[PDB]
Structure formats: C-alpha cells, structure tokens
Predict the 3D structure of the following.
Amino acid sequence: AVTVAVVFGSSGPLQTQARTRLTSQNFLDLPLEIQPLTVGVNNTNPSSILTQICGLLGAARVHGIVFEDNVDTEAVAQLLDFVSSQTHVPILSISGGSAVVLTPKEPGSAFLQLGVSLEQQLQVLFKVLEEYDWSAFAVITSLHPGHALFLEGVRAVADASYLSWRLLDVLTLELGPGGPRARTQRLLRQVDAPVLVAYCSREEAEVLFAEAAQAGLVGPGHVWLVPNLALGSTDAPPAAFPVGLISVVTESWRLSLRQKVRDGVAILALGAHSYRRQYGTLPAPAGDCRSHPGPVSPAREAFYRHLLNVTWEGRDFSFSPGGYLVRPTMVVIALNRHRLWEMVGRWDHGVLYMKYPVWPRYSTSLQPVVDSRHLTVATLEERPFVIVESPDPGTGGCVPNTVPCRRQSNHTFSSGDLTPYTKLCCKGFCIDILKKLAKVVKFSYDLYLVTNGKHGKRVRGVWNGMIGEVYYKRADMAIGSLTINEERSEIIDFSVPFVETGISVMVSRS
Amino acid sequence: KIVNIGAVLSTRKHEQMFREAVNQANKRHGSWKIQLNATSVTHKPNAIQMALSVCEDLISSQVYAILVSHPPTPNDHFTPTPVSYTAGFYRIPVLGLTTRMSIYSDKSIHLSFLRTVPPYSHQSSVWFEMMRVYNWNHIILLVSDDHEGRAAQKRLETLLEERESKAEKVLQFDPGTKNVTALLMEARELEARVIILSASEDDAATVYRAAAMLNMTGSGYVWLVGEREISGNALRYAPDGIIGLQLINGKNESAHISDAVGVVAQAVHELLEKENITDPPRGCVGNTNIWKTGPLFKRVLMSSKYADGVTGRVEFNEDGDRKFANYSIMNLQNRKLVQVGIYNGTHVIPNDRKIIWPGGETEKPRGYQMSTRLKIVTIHQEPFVYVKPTMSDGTCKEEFTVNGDPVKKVICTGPNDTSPGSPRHTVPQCCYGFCIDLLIKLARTMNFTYEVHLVADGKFGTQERVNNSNKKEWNGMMGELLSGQADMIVAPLTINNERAQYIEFSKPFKYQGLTILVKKEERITGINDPRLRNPSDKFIYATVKQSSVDIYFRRQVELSTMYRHMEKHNYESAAEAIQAVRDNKLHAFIWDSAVLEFEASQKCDLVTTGELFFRSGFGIGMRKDSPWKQNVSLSILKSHENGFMEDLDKTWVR
Ligand SMILES: *[C@@H]1O[C@H](CO)[C@@H](O[C@@H]2O[C@H](CO)[C@@H](O[C@H]3O[C@H](CO)[C@@H](O)[C@H](O)[C@@H]3O)[C@H](O)[C@H]2NC(C)=O)[C@H](O)[C@H]1NC(C)=O
Ligand SMILES: *[C@@H]1O[C@H](CO)[C@@H](O[C@@H]2O[C@H](CO)[C@@H](O[C@H]3O[C@H](CO)[C@@H](O)[C@H](O)[C@@H]3O)[C@H](O)[C@H]2NC(C)=O)[C@H](O)[C@H]1NC(C)=O
Ligand SMILES: *[C@@H]1O[C@H](CO)[C@@H](O[C@@H]2O[C@H](CO)[C@@H](O)[C@H](O)[C@H]2NC(C)=O)[C@H](O)[C@H]1NC(C)=O
Ligand SMILES: *[C@@H]1O[C@H](CO)[C@@H](O[C@@H]2O[C@H](CO)[C@@H](O)[C@H](O)[C@H]2NC(C)=O)[C@H](O)[C@H]1NC(C)=O
Ligand SMILES: *[C@@H]1O[C@H](CO)[C@@H](O)[C@H](O)[C@H]1NC(C)=O
Ligand SMILES: *[C@@H]1O[C@H](CO)[C@@H](O)[C@H](O)[C@H]1NC(C)=O
Ligand SMILES: *[C@@H]1O[C@H](CO)[C@@H](O)[C@H](O)[C@H]1NC(C)=O
Ligand SMILES: *[C@@H]1O[C@H](CO)[C@@H](O)[C@H](O)[C@H]1NC(C)=O
Ligand SMILES: *[C@@H]1O[C@H](CO)[C@@H](O)[C@H](O)[C@H]1NC(C)=O
Ligand SMILES: *[C@@H]1O[C@H](CO)[C@@H](O)[C@H](O)[C@H]1NC(C)=O
C-alpha cells in the first residue's frame, strides 16, 4: 500500500474535497490499491500551501503527490518547483494554472509539469495552417514575459518550416491597465493581414480582442491563432472572444476533474509499480517537513528512469526531460459561432485529422460567408488522368505536386458527421491543369472524389455522377475524362474542350 | 502615506546602517507624511521558515520593496530564490545585489527581480572587446554543462554573430567530473591559440591542472575567464599570465545598500507623485490576489535613472540590470594579481604595465597556428581511387607503370570492408590513383604534409532529418569535415548548390557528365524515355543513396516518380551495382560519365547510352574561409595550363 497526496488548490466549493476523498479509496481497479490522503487549501496562498505541504511531509511516509489548481494562477508552479527542489519530492500538476509548462527547471526538481511545450503547440498550429496553406501570417504579442522566448520559438519553427512561410509582421504591444492607445490602436488600424498569430495572457487577450473589434480588424478575412496561455475557462468564454478562434489542448480538457485526478493517480501508481516489478521494492518514501537530506536518491532516480516512458489505458503519458510531456495526443479546439468551444481537429502521432475540409468564415451576424474565388471541385477516378492514392504514411499528408482530396463524404448514411475524413493524395493531368487554372485565375478550390457511380447519366429521369453533383447544385465545377455530348449539354454548360478524343475500337495486334 | 522597506542581509551590522540608510533617504529627501521607514531580517539556512517569516513580517506589513544579499557561506542562488518566488505571488519588486547567476536574469520565472551586478554571462560581452582590441579571429569556446554556462555561451554567440563572425568551435563539459583531457587533446590538434573558459572554481582548477598535464600553458595559447575561476584552488592552479576581470565593488555591500536605498527612495517618491499606489496585500494568508500596481512600480524601477549612486550612475539595462558597468582587467604575473586596464563600455582603457602572456613572452600572440599536416578523406573509386591491402610487412607493393615508373601510393587507414559487413577494423591499406596523384602534386606545390583516411560510412551524404531528430544533418565526408575529422576533401565530388552553402568548392579540376549504363534491343532514351517516366517492374534502375544524383532527382519534382523508384533499389557503392547490372539484377544505372566510360574502356561488355543529361565538374572542395582555397585554385589553373592533369589522365585513362 502506497500513500499519496491529492492536493486541491482551485478553491471552489468545499463539496469537492469530500466527493473526491471518498473516491480516493475507490481506486481498486489499479494495482496495489493506493492509500490517498487529500487536502484542499481554500485560500490558495504560498504560506498556507507550504504549511499543508510541510505538514503532510511530516505526517507519514508519502511517495508521490498530485496537485490541482485554478486556471488563472502561475506562482504556485514555481512554489511547487521550490518544494520539489528543496525536498527532492516527485510531484505532478493537473487542472488550470500549474499545468502551464515552464521551460527552465531547477536540476534538483522533480515537479514534472503535466502540460505541453509552447514550441510543440507551434508545430501543431503551423501544421494546421499548412492544412489551409495560409503562408501569410502576422505575429502579434504583448510585453508579457516569455514573449522573447515565444518570438524565439516562432523564429525557430519558421526557420525549420518547409515553405517560405510569410512572416507579415512581428510586433509587440502594451497591454494591462489602460495603456497608450496612440500609435498602438492606430498601429492596429495600420496592420494589414488576413491571418494573425498571437501570444499574451488571458485578460490581455480579453483586452486585445476588444481592441481588435474596435480596431475593425475582425470578421471574415481575419483569422486568429493563439496559444494555451491566452485561452482559459473553455466552459466560460467571454463576450470579448471573437467567433472562430483556434488553439490546441489536451484531450483531457473535456474530462471531469475526478477523471483527471484518477488518471494522475494511475500514472503515479504505474510508475511506482513498474519500480516494484523491476526492483521488487516499494518506492522510497519522500523527505521531511524540515531540511533536506542531500543528494538525489538512487531509488528516486529509478522512479525518474522508469517514469518518463509510462502509458495507461491506450494513452502514452510520456514526459520530456524538461519536466513536461513529449509527443502526446492533442485536440485542436475551435471556438464556434455559437460562442462554444468544440473539436475541429486532432493531432496524434504526427497526423492531422480535421472534420472541416474548408474553413468556415462566419460573419458578424451569425451567418456563414462563402468566398467567390473558392470553389467546389468534383471528379471521378481514372488512371491516365485522375490518380488517387493513400497519403504518405511516412511523413503524413501528401507529397508535393499532389492535392489533398476526399471521398464524396459518406452522404449515403453519413452526410458529413464522420469527423475523421479519409485524406487521399490526388495527382494527375487534370490535377495539373486545375493547378494552372488556380494559379492563373487566382481562385481557391475544394477537391473531393465523387462516389455515387460514374461520370453521370440520366437514371430514371434524374442524373448522377459529376453531372448530378453540379446540375443539382451539390457542386460547382467538374473535371476529368468528360466527353461533351448533347444529352450532357442541355442541362449543364461546358467550356471549350482542351484535349480531343473520340470513340475507338481496340484490338489485339496478334 | 507611510512607506516601509524590507531587507534580508547577512552581516546583522549593515542592517543598522540600513536603518541609517532609510534615515539617509529621510535625510536626502523630505519627510512630510511620506514616513520613510525601515525593516530588516537575516535569512536562515532553511528557506521554508525564511519565506514564512517574509510573509508574516513583510507582506503583512506596509512593505513596498525587498532587498537581499549573499550569505558568508558560498551557496549563492540557494538563498534568494524562494524570495524571488514569494514576490512573484504578489508582484512586489525584489532587489538581489550579490548574485552572478543568469537564472535570476529570467523574467518569466523571476518576475520582479533586479540586480545592480550583471551576471557571469554578461562577462561574455566584456571579452567580446578583447579579440576586437588585439585583432583575434580564431576563438575557441569551452563551457560547462550548467545552465549559467549555456546562457553565457548563447550570449557570446549572439555577440560574435553581431560582427557576422563565428567561433570555429564550441565544446561542453561536466562539472568536477572524470576524464576531460580528451577535450584538451582535441584542442591541441585544433587551430586556434586564444582560448576562453567558463566554469566553477573547482572546475577551473581541474581544467588548469589537466591543461598543465597537457602542456597547454605554453606560449601562444591564451585563456580568459571571469573572477570566479581565479580564486582559491583555481587561483593556485592558475598559471601566471592569465587575464581576468574584476568587479570595481565586488563585495562592498555598503555601497550596494546605499545605491539601492537611493534608487528605491527615488522610485517611491516618483510613484507617490504619480499616486494610486494601492497597498501591499497585508499578509500571505487570506489575501490571495496579485498587486495591481506591481507592473507599474517595476516599469518605473526600469526607468529609475538614479545617477546619484556611490558607484556612479545606476543605469538599468533592458532587463533591469546594471548597464555600462565598471570592471578592471587583471594579469596574474609571478603569482601577483596585477591590473592593466579598466572597462566601462564600448572600449577598454589600458592604465599601466604590459601583458605578460602565459608562455612567459611579452609579445601578443596571433590567434591561430596553421598545421602543415592536413587531413585527406575520400571514398574508394576505381577510376580515381585504387585501394589494395598492404603486405604482411605493412608497405605498398613495388608496382611500376607501363613506362616503368612506380605508382605513387600512400597508406590510407580505415575500416576493412563496409562497416555492417565488416568487424569495424580500421586497417590501413595501400591507396593510389588519379586524385592521389593530383593531391601529391599540389602538396609538393604548397609543401605541406597530410594524413589520408577514407570516409567512415562510405556514402557521400546530405542534410537529412535522421531518425529521432529534427534538423537535417549532413553525413559522409561533408559531415566529417564540418565536425573537423577531416579538413579538406579530395575525391571526384560533384559540385551542387546544396553543398555550396556549407563547403567551399574551388574551381573545377575535371569536367564530366551524368549518363546511363546497360549491358551488351530498346536503346534507352536517356532521360526522355517514358519507360523511365512511368516506372515498370520489368525495368529496374537506381542510384547511390545520399549522393549527388539523389539530390538532383530530389530537386526536379517532375522527376519525383523516378525518385520514388530510386528508394526501391538504391545501391550503396559502385561495385555491387556494376556487378548486378553485369548480372542483370539491375537493368540500367545512372552515374558519372567518366566512371562509366572508364569501366567500359576497361571492362567492356557494357555500354553507356544517352547524352550527358547533366554536365558538371569534379572540383576539389575544402573547408569554408580557410586561406588555401586561392592557392589550390591557381594551382589547378596552372596545372591546366601545362596540361599536367591531361598527363595524369593519360597515365590513368588509356
Ligand atoms: C451502371 O451500370 C450498371 C449495369 O448496367 C447499373 O448498375 C446496377 O443498377 C441496378 C439497379 O437496379 C443495381 O441493382 C440493385 O437493385 C436490385 C433490385 O432492383 C438489387 O437486387 C441489387 O442487389 C442492387 O441493389 C445493380 O446492383 C447495379 N450494378 C452495379 C454493378 O452497380 C447502372 O446502369 C449503373 N450503376 C451505377 C452505380 O452507375
Ligand atoms: C598562397 O598561400 C600563401 C600562404 O598561405 C599566401 O601567399 C603568401 O604570402 C606571403 C606573405 O607575403 C608570401 O611570403 C613572402 O612575403 C613575405 C612578406 O614580404 C616574406 O616575409 C616571405 O619571405 C615571402 O617573401 C608568400 O610567398 C605567399 N605565397 C605564395 C605561394 O606566393 C596566399 O594564401 C597564397 N598566395 C598565392 C600567390 O598563391
Ligand atoms: C516602522 O518600522 C518598524 C520596524 O521595521 C516597525 O516596527 C515593527 O512593526 C511591526 C509591524 O508594523 C511590529 O510587528 C513589530 O513589533 C515592530 N517592531 C518594533 C521594534 O517596533 C514600525 O511599526 C514601523 N512603523 C511604521 C509607521 O511604518
Ligand atoms: C565601501 O563603500 C563605501 C561607500 O558606499 C565606503 O565608505 C566611504 O567611501 C568614500 C568613497 O569616496 C570614502 O571617501 C569614505 O571615507 C568612506 N567612508 C568611511 C567611513 O571610510 C567604504 O570605504 C567602502 N569600503 C570598502 C572596503 O570598499
Ligand atoms: C521504461 O524505460 C526503462 C528504461 O529506461 C525500461 O526498463 C522500462 O521497461 C520502460 N517501461 C516501463 C517502465 O513501463
Ligand atoms: C582522463 O584522460 C586520460 C584517459 O582518458 C587519463 O590519463 C587522465 O589522467 C584523465 N584525466 C582526468 C582529469 O580524469
Ligand atoms: C610536454 O612537454 C614535455 C617536454 O617539455 C614532453 O616531454 C611531453 O611529452 C609533453 N607532453 C604533452 C602532452 O605535450
Ligand atoms: C562607474 O560607472 C559609472 C556609470 O557611468 C561612472 O560613474 C563611471 O564610469 C564609473 N565610476 C568611476 C568613479 O569611474
Ligand atoms: C571609462 O573609465 C574612465 C577612467 O576611469 C572614466 O573616465 C569613465 O568611466 C570611462 N571613460 C571612457 C572614455 O569610456
Ligand atoms: C616547404 O614548406 C614550408 C611550410 O609548408 C614552406 O614555408 C617552405 O617555403 C616550403 N619550401 C619549398 C621549397 O616549397
């Protein structure tokens, strides 16, 4: 039996404490049924927090400690770093606040924040930007600390980025109490960019969004992309937050607090029981309320040598040497036009799965806006011209000179409710000519493969294929090995043919 | 309207002077209702109770600032760090005046920390002028693995990048650990003379004693550190002639207290006349919110240009640290620490004496020592490189040309056969041939010795995001050169723009092209056959991995499909591919014109087809910015003038 500490630090109602304490002993599903002792600080201050910590340190032989916090505090992470450095104690963080990742850590610390590094979030968001291939983007930050590291990170990613990713403008602004609007609000008014990437705090984001709405830089044709620090309280997004905001978080965002606590306890217990397997011994207890013994424990080193590569219930909860997580699964979340946060994509194992082949740019009055230039493109598979294949599995996505394409949804039963959409690599003669058309006429496009049959024929008096998708307004334009005939011509318009063909009789030479 | 200031000192006596210091403020500025007051404590070895008292005594009181100093026991960042955390919870400023740790320079973790002494990393900027003063270009960096060392390394990297220059290499080490003499050895076979170091006192002493074991104390070699590395045991093991930087104040805690009190009083008066100062949280317990005017007080502290300090102008930098600081240049002469100059900005000023260099000389040594023994790396290529096993006696066979002269052969070391199939025995073997002949000629022309050793992997190489990595990294001889294993390449290497960014190609020494080889009926249509354009299972073809042709087929995306064919059957060397084509395991091989025509004129039974779809040169490559490029360029020019390379070809191609 291992004794652990479940620390509550998000204030809130006091009903949380007992409603978690009775379930603390209800963890029988996990090996070596844990003896968790929980405590909750209703004041959330360094003195009381340290008092509880040191009291539980002197209370009994505890091995691992987990802590939860409210979504708008930062110093508690550093306080627990001090605890785990001075006392050499393994700890874990959950919920808002402490889960924020601090790239520098004291060498003697073992606090091991449970979150995602900022640069990894940048990697995910630039991959998403590649999905909608918006090479033009503007960098907008405030004078909030860490923005130097943020600009270093964006410089590093853009430097490691493949395409000539246009940094339209890198700029820093003043946010907080009031602030000078002169040459800063006018600076906003002179900023000209359709895609913006931001970095600031939660209330800084609240103020900046209000200014941007007051700046006139809001609405369709203006997209924002912000990190986790800017966002907060996904349940309660303020009115200042514009619709169509994008970020990426952990899958546990939607889980309940009890589930998060149980998962943290499970990870701790699995590390402990892996130690128990390999070395046949229970984990070495932690330090004391008073001063520290000195050097690191070799058994604590064993816990830090089997802890970093732990998994539980399908999820590999691996950690980075920087006291945070490495390549976990992430959910790309997006604020909708209903002022609600839902799932727009998923980044897992270096793979992006989005439910939106195109980005919906809803306008101010809660209505979608359709671009004139962007246009739905439909086709049928054909080896000489319409080459379809699986996306490159080694690196994800598609190779160059190839377009991402999709099946004709699954509208026979799934009219667009299947969020994992099977991407395909579409390349060929028709792909090349449509690429040239796009690069000349300067219009976007949306490609998807048609499934309901073949080219198209009036069946039972109604048409099908690309002919159906276009004549019945389900699509805009169709391309492929399409022959022009009158029966095809009365109901739909054709351009001038580009490559001539005809009927032919094929035979064996011998 | 009452004000109070918190102090955490170590002497327990300056505290009383601190009591005077606030009085000094009340004696330097008006009293009125400002009610300038003082509060002081001494930190404890156990920081828990220290922070608890800080809450129950300072935050609980009307304290608007906190200062801290260093304890007599050497622990540094051990003591003040929890304070930096505590202040962060309430955004109150904290002033640490006796710390050289760059960790405190962070604003993300230490929100409201300030220092009037720049950290050890800022010392880098100091030495930045050294090389500028004495015109030193070849600079070698050696740094500990500690974060302070990493910060100093990146700071000096930025500085040297400002002049669009670079250190020729940087090396890292662990603190107080075991074998370090490998680094000092590779420093011996390095090029530079002037060395710069950064470590702890015990670490510096270990480096000193190891370098003394390795004769690094001799003339020409120069070392450069701060004041940490020249104390105690490190000072004892530091040889004479070492140059160091000294703080003008160093340990005058009284001057630091006076200047801090003055600037604090000035900032407090400015805040009071700017009003809306709110109040301290009045206790850690209970009050859980942040202090709103904390950022405002921090920014006015940033702009607090209190120039009336005892140390002169107390000017904060961008990060809130002392800017245009004062230091002195000291030279260790005959066990005496002698000063030679002063530093306060963009220009060191000499004051007295002369620099007694570590080798005991009086003249300023140059920054490098050109090594007349260069490094030769290559790959075995029969048209250009012949490699044979030496006899039991370990020499080359007395094999003479048809004209009767012996072939000039050397002893190139390296693995006995390819590493996966080999037991990884770096067996020296006889090697000779065209490239060998020309390198011997140009060496006789420049009169320099050399060392011959073929490439480890056997592949040419390219930038690649290798497994478990992120940055595209070279391999092959380009990687071996960029690492410094070899200093210049001698091989029928192809010039490409990708290599051009990293390896200095001289003028081409030979011209050649790219073509296709088959056996002995569908004469292949060069690079215009559809049967290439749409790959077939009946026709199998490939090239060498990490090679120039791979780069070419990668650039032309229109050819990418054949590149997709490449990754199926790509070979690793010319011999196996040639035999397989002779065995019809492969159908056609894309490679150099010269290689294919050579084997055809010697082996027969196989023919090249199609024209030289890509013409280029084989040019002798070498390291960037090394002086020898112009010499070898004009040498190969004059060799083309008298046709000596043509004579070489007639010796090797009949
Ligand atoms: C393409 O040509 C096909 C043959 O000329 C023909 O498709 C066939 O259409 C019939 C429609 O009656 C399908 O039969 C379906 O309905 C019967 C009952 O009426 C069921 O018993 C069957 O199981 C089936 O559900 C055929 O299955 C279908 N054949 C194929 C191969 O699809 C249409 O003229 C054209 N069809 C399409 C899809 O383009
Ligand atoms: C070839 O390499 C050389 C060394 O890397 C260098 O050119 C050399 O420059 C020195 C300096 O002038 C010449 O030395 C002559 O001049 C000095 C100063 O007057 C005298 O003290 C010497 O005794 C000597 O007379 C070298 O002669 C000269 N080397 C050559 C081959 O000319 C350049 O990097 C390269 N220069 C050329 C021309 O290839
Ligand atoms: C001026 O400063 C002195 C010392 O810093 C204060 O004296 C202490 O005040 C605290 C709380 O204000 C008490 O808990 C201590 O018992 C006091 N000690 C002594 C020796 O007096 C004093 O209160 C401050 N006064 C003002 C007006 O700021
Ligand atoms: C430490 O610095 C203090 C000043 O902060 C020195 O005290 C005075 O320094 C001035 C310098 O111009 C002298 O003129 C005074 O005579 C000093 N006062 C006294 C009472 O001597 C102090 O001397 C310095 N001490 C050391 C060891 O550096
Ligand atoms: C984690 O890694 C260690 C070695 O680093 C290994 O022994 C262990 O089997 C791995 N898996 C665990 C602890 O579940
Ligand atoms: C390490 O280097 C060599 C062997 O690697 C050894 O002779 C030397 O004494 C060692 N030096 C130190 C400082 O450990
Ligand atoms: C150091 O110099 C001495 C002679 O002064 C020599 O015998 C010894 O081999 C040298 N050792 C090294 C490592 O340079
Ligand atoms: C110390 O630096 C200050 C900053 O300007 C200035 O007084 C001077 O450069 C130095 N002090 C003296 C006495 O030279
Ligand atoms: C640097 O030092 C000199 C001499 O102490 C002093 O005048 C001033 O602080 C600085 N002078 C210059 C020219 O930088
Ligand atoms: C021999 O080589 C040395 C150094 O490489 C050079 O100084 C000298 O001039 C050379 N002598 C001849 C005759 O080339």
In short: The longest strand of chain B covers residues 606-622. Chain B touches chain A through 34 residues (CB under 8 Å).
